[PDB]
Amino acid sequence: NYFPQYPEYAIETARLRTFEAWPRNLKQKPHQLAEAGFFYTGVGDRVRCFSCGGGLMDWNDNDEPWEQHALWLSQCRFVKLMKGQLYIDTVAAKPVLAEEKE
């Protein structure tokens, strides 16, 4: 059965709290990332998803937390739950994103 990798960060507010030290430098604001299922690692711009455990870094100004989530961690339960399967499929179809993936 499925169970989140980090049960402690299953709550949005708990995730948001980790972004206290998040660099103000980055365009991806704490709200966007936390709502996407991410919590800050405390190092650089590294984040991890509470459900799948996957971690993303090196965020570009043009990156949307949800898109990056669905593109790289397409098997993630939280993405499927909040965004749906079609979104995941559409994300992977967008040229710019498809190329990131290679």
Binding site: G54, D58, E100
Partner: peptide, 8 residues
């Protein structure tokens, strides 16, 4: 973004 960790 690029992943630094992906599930097994």
């Amino acid at each position: 973004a690029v992943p630094f960790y992906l599930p097994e």
